[PDB]
Structure 1
């Protein structure tokens, strides 16, 4: 699994994921499912910004959380957008709204419901992707054009298939449920 992560992911995404887990006291060599899940979520955030113009998105995910709040503050002060209660993943400069990106191995609408209750902000856009080519966005507003989201779904389906060929998928899918159960 650790071998798969460094094989399928850009080494900068890998280092970002390693840097993130170390700052939270987690070993990437042990919590291998979370390692792959952080890499996958980070890649989707990068592929999401590619779907718009070079003026379109500000990527908040993958940066130092303390510094990421200063940019959130600068955006809210400049644009007048209400400040979110949790750090989002992107800011949309065109629609002038923050975006939460979800990547789940569970069902998309159940995952949306959990994010919507936890975010509990309104005006923070939610877009969920699954490894089964499904997606769900707030009020059916998918933000990106069809070709941009197709690239994301295909990439996630690709990751699933190659995990499935290494017998790693079923452990990856069950880990999110295990993380959800412990409460």
Structure 2
């Protein structure tokens, strides 16, 4: 019973919490011990959901928040339909408007450091990368931030609200020095 766990359950939406619990357990991990990663998984989930909520109704296909098999199954259907190459690592969304997959990232370092980390992991110059930070910064591939400034601003605001709430409970320091 950690403070972080009870904060995550109060700060985040119940479906998002349930989805982060499944996702960690599927990879042999307990939201009750690795609670800093519990909070991070919820954060990454919410950001992905607000992101798809930006733009038009049929614009995005949500890959994050499914189980491994069904997620991949949809990645196929997208590839064997649009001709886009099959990514080596599971992405977060697919853009039907731009015809490309999106890897969303949420970092407690510089967006510089962390995009470099992921851009080297995925290597493929097809999958679009978009980064958010808890300080309000953002960095996307080819400076193509995909969404409206207003939609990205809402995400940035929510990320800073989570930081303040974590800090007022003294959990922020441990959360930052954990990534």
Structure 2 runs not aligned, ≥5 long: none
Q: CA deviation at 1:42?
A: 0.2
Q: Which residue, 81, 86, 90 being the options, matches 2:89?
A: 86
Q: CA deviation at 1:27?
A: 1.4
C-alpha deviations, 1:90-134, integer Å up to 9, x for none? 000000000000001011011000000001111100000000000
Matched residues in 2 for 1:19 and 1:125: separation?
Answer: 26
**TM-score, normalising length: structure 1:** 0.94
- The farther-off stretch of 62-71 and 97-106 is 62-71
Matched residues in 2 for 1:55 and 1:11: separation?
Answer: 25
Matched residues in 1 for 2:72 and 2:78: separation?
Answer: 10
Over aligned residues, Cα RMSD in angstroms? 0.6
Matched residues in 2 for 1:26 and 1:77: separation?
Answer: 33
Q: CA deviation at 1:142?
A: 0.3
Q: Size of the alignment, in residue pairs? A: 175
**TM-score, normalising length: structure 2:** 0.96
Structure 1 runs not aligned, ≥5 long: 176-183
Matched residues in 1 for 2:45 and 2:99: separation?
Answer: 22
Runs of 4+ residues over 3 Å off in structure 1: none
